[PDB]
Amino acid sequence: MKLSKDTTALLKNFATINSGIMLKSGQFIMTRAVNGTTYAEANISDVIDFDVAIYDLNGFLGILSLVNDDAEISQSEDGNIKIADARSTIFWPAADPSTVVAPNKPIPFPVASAVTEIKAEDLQQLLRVSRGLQIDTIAITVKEGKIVINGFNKVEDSALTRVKYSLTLGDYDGENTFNFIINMANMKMQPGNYKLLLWAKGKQGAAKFEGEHANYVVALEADSTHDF
Amino acid sequence: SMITVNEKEHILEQKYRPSTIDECILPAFDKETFKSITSKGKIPHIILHSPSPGTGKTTVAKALCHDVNADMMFVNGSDCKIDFVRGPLTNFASAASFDGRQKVIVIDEFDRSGLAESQRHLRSFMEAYSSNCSIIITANNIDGIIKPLQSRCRVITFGQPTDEDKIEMMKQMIRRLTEICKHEGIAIADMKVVAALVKKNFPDFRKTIGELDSYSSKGVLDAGILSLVTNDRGAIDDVLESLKNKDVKQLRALAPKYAADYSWFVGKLAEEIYSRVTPQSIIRMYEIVGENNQYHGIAANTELHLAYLFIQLACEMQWK
Amino acid sequence: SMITVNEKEHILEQKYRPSTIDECILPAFDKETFKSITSKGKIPHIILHSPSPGTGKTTVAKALCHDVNADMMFVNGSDCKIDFVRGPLTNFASAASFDGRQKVIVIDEFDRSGLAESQRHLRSFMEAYSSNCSIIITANNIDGIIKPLQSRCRVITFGQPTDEDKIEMMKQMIRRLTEICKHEGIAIADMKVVAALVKKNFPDFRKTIGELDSYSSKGVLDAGILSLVTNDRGAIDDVLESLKNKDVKQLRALAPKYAADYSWFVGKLAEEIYSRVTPQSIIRMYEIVGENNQYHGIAANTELHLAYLFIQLACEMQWK
Amino acid sequence: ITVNEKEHILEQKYRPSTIDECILPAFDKETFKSITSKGKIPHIILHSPSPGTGKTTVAKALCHDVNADMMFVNGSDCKIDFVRGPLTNFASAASFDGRQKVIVIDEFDRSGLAESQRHLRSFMEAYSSNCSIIITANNIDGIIKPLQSRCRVITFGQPTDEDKIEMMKQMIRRLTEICKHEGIAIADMKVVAALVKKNFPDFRKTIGELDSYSSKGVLAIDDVLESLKNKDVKQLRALAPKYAADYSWFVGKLAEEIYSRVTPQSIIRMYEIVGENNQYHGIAANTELHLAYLFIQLACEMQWK
Amino acid sequence: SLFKDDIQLNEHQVAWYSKDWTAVQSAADSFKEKAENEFFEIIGAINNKTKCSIAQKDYSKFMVENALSQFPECMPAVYAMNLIGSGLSDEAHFNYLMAAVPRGKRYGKWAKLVEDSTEVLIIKLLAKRYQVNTNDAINYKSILTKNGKLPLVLKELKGLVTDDFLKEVTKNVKEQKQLKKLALEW
DNA sequence: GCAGACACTACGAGTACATA
DNA sequence: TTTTTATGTACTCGTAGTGTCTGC
Ligand SMILES: Nc1ncnc2c1ncn2[C@@H]1O[C@H](COP(=O)(O)OP(=O)(O)O)[C@@H](O)[C@H]1O
Ligand SMILES: [Mg+2]
Ligand SMILES: [Mg+2]
Numbered sequence A: 001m002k003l004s005k006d007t008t009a010l011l012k013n014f015a016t017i018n019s020g021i022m023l024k025s026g027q028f029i030m031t032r033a034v035n036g037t038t039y040a041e042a043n044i045s046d047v048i049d050f051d052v053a054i055y056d057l058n059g060f061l062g063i064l065s066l067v068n069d070d071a072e073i074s075q076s077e078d079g080n081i082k083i084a085d086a087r088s089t090i091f092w093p094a095a096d097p098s099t100v101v102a103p104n105k106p107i108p109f110p111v112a113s114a115v116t117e118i119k120a121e122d123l124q125q126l127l128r129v130s131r132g133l134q135i136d137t138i139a140i141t142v143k144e145g146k147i148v149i150n151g152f153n154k155v156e157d158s159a160l161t162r163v164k165y166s167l168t169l170g171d172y173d174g175e176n177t178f179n180f181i182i183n184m185a186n187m188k189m190q191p192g193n194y195k196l197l198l199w200a201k202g203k204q205g206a207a208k209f210e211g212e213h214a215n216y217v218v219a220l221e222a223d224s225t226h227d228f
Numbered sequence B, C: 001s002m003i004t005v006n007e008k009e010h011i012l013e014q015k016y017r018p019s020t021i022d023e024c025i026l027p028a029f030d031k032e033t034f035k036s037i038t039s040k041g042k043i044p045h046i047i048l049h050s051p052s053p054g055t056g057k058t059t060v061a062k063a064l065c066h067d068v069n070a071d072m073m074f075v076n077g078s079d080c081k082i083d084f085v086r087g088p089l090t091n092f093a094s095a096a097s098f099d100g101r102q103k104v105i106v107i108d109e110f111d112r113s114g115l116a117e118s119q120r121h122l123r124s125f126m127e128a129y130s131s132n133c134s135i136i137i138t139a140n141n142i143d144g145i146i147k148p149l150q151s152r153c154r155v156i157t158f159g160q161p162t163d164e165d166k167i168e169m170m171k172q173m174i175r176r177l178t179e180i181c182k183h184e185g186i187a188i189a190d191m192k193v194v195a196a197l198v199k200k201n202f203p204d205f206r207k208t209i210g211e212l213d214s215y216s217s218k219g220v221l222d223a224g225i226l227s228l229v230t231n232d233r234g235a236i237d238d239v240l241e242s243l244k245n246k247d248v249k250q251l252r253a254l255a256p257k258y259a260a261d262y263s264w265f266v267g268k269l270a271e272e273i274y275s276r277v278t279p280q281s282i283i284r285m286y287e288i289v290g291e292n293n294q295y296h297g298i299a300a301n302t303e304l305h306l307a308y309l310f311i312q313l314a315c316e317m318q319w320k
Numbered sequence D: 001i002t003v004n005e006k007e008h009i010l011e012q013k014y015r016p017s018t019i020d021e022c023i024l025p026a027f028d029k030e031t032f033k034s035i036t037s038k039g040k041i042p043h044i045i046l047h048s049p050s051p052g053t054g055k056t057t058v059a060k061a062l063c064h065d066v067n068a069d070m071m072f073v074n075g076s077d078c079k080i081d082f083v084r085g086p087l088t089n090f091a092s093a094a095s096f097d098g099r100q101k102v103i104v105i106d107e108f109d110r111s112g113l114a115e116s117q118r119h120l121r122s123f124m125e126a127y128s129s130n131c132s133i134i135i136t137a138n139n140i141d142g143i144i145k146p147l148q149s150r151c152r153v154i155t156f157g158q159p160t161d162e163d164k165i166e167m168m169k170q171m172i173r174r175l176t177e178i179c180k181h182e183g184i185a186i187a188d189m190k191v192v193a194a195l196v197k198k199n200f201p202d203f204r205k206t207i208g209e210l211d212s213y214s215s216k217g218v219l220a221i222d223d224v225l226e227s228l229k230n231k232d233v234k235q236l237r238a239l240a241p242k243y244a245a246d247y248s249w250f251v252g253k254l255a256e257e258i259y260s261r262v263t264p265q266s267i268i269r270m271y272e273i274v275g276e277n278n279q280y281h282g283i284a285a286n287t288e289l290h291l292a293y294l295f296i297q298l299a300c301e302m303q304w305k
Numbered sequence E: 001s002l003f004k005d006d007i008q009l010n011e012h013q014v015a016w017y018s019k020d021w022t023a024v025q026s027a028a029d030s031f032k033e034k035a036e037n038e039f040f041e042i043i044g045a046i047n048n049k050t051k052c053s054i055a056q057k058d059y060s061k062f063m064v065e066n067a068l069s070q071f072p073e074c075m076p077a078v079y080a081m082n083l084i085g086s087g088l089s090d091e092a093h094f095n096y097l098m099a100a101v102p103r104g105k106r107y108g109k110w111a112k113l114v115e116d117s118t119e120v121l122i123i124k125l126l127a128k129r130y131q132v133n134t135n136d137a138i139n140y141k142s143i144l145t146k147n148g149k150l151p152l153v154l155k156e157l158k159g160l161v162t163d164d165f166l167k168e169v170t171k172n173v174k175e176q177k178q179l180k181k182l183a184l185e186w
Numbered sequence F: 001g002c003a004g005a006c007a008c009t010a011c012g013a014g015t016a017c018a019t020a
Numbered sequence G: 001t002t003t004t005t006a007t008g009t010a011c012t013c014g015t016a017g018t019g020t021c022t023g024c
């Protein structure tokens, strides 16, 4: 099998979720944070022709950056990984799929509860600002029938009170009150526009980011509030 | 059957580790106190400490989370340094369990000295996240848990059963072993050997199983295997007789014979002289053997140091 | 042969280290208990401890892995500090053995005090990786292995053969030595000298070979070499004579002479004074030597601690 | 006879080059030649205990006579991480010249060395082809058993009445030739044979004695002993931490020099007092303090002028 | 210093408001002030037979043990706690001493040796050079001083005084005075 | 192309612990 | 009127020096 700068790209991303990854034969890759805070899944170009466990995902993505695009990835006769570049050959380990934290099946979202979208451009403006503004916690609520995001700094106001930042996401059509609170630490997804499906049942709830390329599902936090 | 098998493993004291809280062999009040919890449906903070290993702590930690359907994160205590708490443990605890499950962090074997600072950072953490998430701690030695942490936890103390519980718990293990035998294909010719395994290393139910593993070499426990478990390799009659007669040439000769396992022989001696000698000579024989035992292993020539015990005895010991 | 030769080395007690578990000279039940394992085809956690050196522990550790076709990693205990476990040992154990082999980590000579914390981190590790991978530990002194680790392991205890095994095992070594001689080109004129080597330092099969090296100076073992091996001194006359005469300058001088094997010299002393002194001075000489023996090996300067024995004797020992 | 012509101390520049030059008794010289015969060296421990016998010399020799690539290291300096870094960097390394690598450790029967000695158990085995170790000891028991197992333990000294006369003849003939080289003059030939008889087993002393009449070119336990006479504490209490280092040696030099300087019935007590203090050393938590308790015990009961 | 009306701000305000953390650093460092060690309150409790005030505090078995070693009257019970000290409750160790050392009094001064650290140098530099230990290194100094004046030996060896070696001998600028002294009168 | 900015490494200082 | 033993190991903090990724 052969991996493309497009997919080597989508993986450096799943490295910010789990240091390792489980990939089974196919066009589809999933991973989940060890502590279950984040779940990613995607369908890909390059085709995955054998199963394997990768303990180091980000360091092997580092070693595949040193060969040519034409390089042929195969299971090694000796069961590890052989990367054959044209003039060269590299040997990288496999761990057993016990020490890498795989989800079982590709967790399907429920019927959503509310839905909005976000433009690629406006994701940039959030992440990039959070650093400066020290926005470590954000909240999706409604304002004037129009859903806004809100940045806060949780250490400064533990209460999510002085809202340091806000971005209006689109019109809110239905009728419900909600404050969903997401830890900036779980936002691991790559940039671009996402359809946003969030769901809540009492002390239940979750937020799915549906991208063009891969899907992302992020846990809410416990002070999150709503009637649904 | 009623027993759990992990079937993903061969090591047998780990193949049979209990799935639920009912399977665990526990003192009366300790079981009751756990069933109670599994009821309330939410788990408080809990410390489970041995200090004798293999009493079920790390099993019950995993158990409780199962019986409550916890959303659980298991952690090696010694891997649990401070920045671990800060990043992953804190992410986990701040995460909304979205299917409405108790979040529980099991920190196994947390009693290392080095982890003090991590445990300190933890003291304000367990308070901030107490609504969402709770912590179960396992330790061999409590004093390695800073006091402020024992305040915050229900401290349950394993392996100190009452005289009544010991007897009952053992009886429960003999049955539990028997049912393992049925499962593994080991056949029991004499039951006395299953009982003797349980009694021999009691407090610890792990080595109690892995002792059954290694005495099953031949696939049967017969009254022969019983000899090794209880092991008395003994005929001490030759020494006892020479001590009565207060001679040396004979004692001096027997010393190099028992130089082999001194630890065992000293036992079989204290055992059989205790009955055969006078009451105030009993208080002495312990002073005499007890001292000889202490300094063994400092003693250069074991054979000689054994002779010195024989002379010491023949002189002061008295009986008919 | 039937014998293994490493041929990459000259040091001869290491050229002949047994390849398989059958080659090893072991007590009845200990062999049986290992053959049993090599059968099940998977290895449990095992602790192998002497405390007399060169009984076969570190050989049997390597042996078992061979007879099972383990995928093995060998480690110096003292190099085994905590961050070692964390990085390499943990990488290894988490690695899928892809050709379907048992993974086994042999941690040789793990009984240092300093390694306590590493052994503690290990207690939760051996449980997490128990399906894939197991640990074999070698130690001279058990008490240097934290109890929670002895719970997790099958603890097999070397060098305490039964009266029966000793005799058998020795017989096996006399044959094993003979076959080494054939191989090295040493010729045996009198067999009594091969038997005497084995008996002389028994528990320890290493110095037992390296004693064969150094008594082969002349390339034949004749009844002359037999004299040196069985030799000892017996010449305790110089000390006995100086003790009668109750002088010091002489005794004080003899001390550094016997400082070499104290354990032997104390024996030959108790043996030969027992006949040459009065009956109530016999009860004292044991108290005097018995005590001196106990504290040896605590004693800093062995030579001086030997002088202190001589003075003690010359004063209280009274006899003709 | 060998001379190392860049060195300033007698005993260091006249150190015997070969296993021959050394003055030893019978089974000693045989057993050494028998060893160098095989051209590869086993593990070896050498011990006197009567010092100045050639321990440290015979080691550098056995190496020489095997064309061994030899790393000499003092025991006192052989800490745990010394072993880890260099001594391992050494025995792990293959040699261009394809010789045997050998590590001499002089006087390894010191104290803190204890945990190091345990590191070696599994080291001396792990490079057992490349290299081997020669260990020097004044007291054996100060070498943990699992090392004594790995090593061939040869034990020096105690020559026959015959060896005596021949050795004494050798040493005298040897000193002469040194005087020739150094430009020291021999006025009488009974002064030479005095020196050899005087301190006999100790040839190092006897060469050290000679480096002290040599201003012309022709032929320290005092601090403690003085404080013990004076029966004071402030001074004794101060000296304790000084000798806390090698306790085993100090106790020897004490029993040696008090035996002459104290009364006869006080000799029987000093042994009871030091003999006991010696026994329990190594059980004793604070070695420095346990040494103080010896000083006090002595100053009180020891009586003399 | 312009503007000439600035309500002189304290050392700290200047630092913090302007944000140069090295000023903040000299400022904080100002509070360094490090001593503590109430050890003698425990020790004096054991001498003068008073109220414990312990296990709430940090006890040094070694401090106590050693402090008491100053006085010959205590030794029997300091010694006892030596052979037997390891494996006694930090508290047990304190309960013993209290039940052991009978009288009470002590004034301060502990015993230390005289170090001619000229002479300490010469001995460690022989010990290093020849890879021999200290007691022999001694014999060395004597037969050199006695014969050969050892200026030569001091001359050849001075080359390595490596300033790190100096870190082993004494602790201060007296060290930098030696650096020069061995480089001098040979 | 560089210079600037961010992230990850390592060493030094401090601290605490256990065995001798 | 006081005042710090030796040897090994582990965790955390702080900073400074190294890198790579990025922006005229
Ligand atoms: N057997 C010997 N023959 C010749 N010289 C000797 C002998 N033993 C010791 N010496 C003298 O002692 C010096 C070194 O002694 P050394 O081997 O260090 O004794 P030790 O090992 O007992 O400390 C040598 O320079 C040597 O001249
Ligand atoms: Mg456990
Ligand atoms: Mg070994």
Ligand SMILES: [Mg+2]
Pocket: D056, D106
């Ligand atoms: Mg020497």
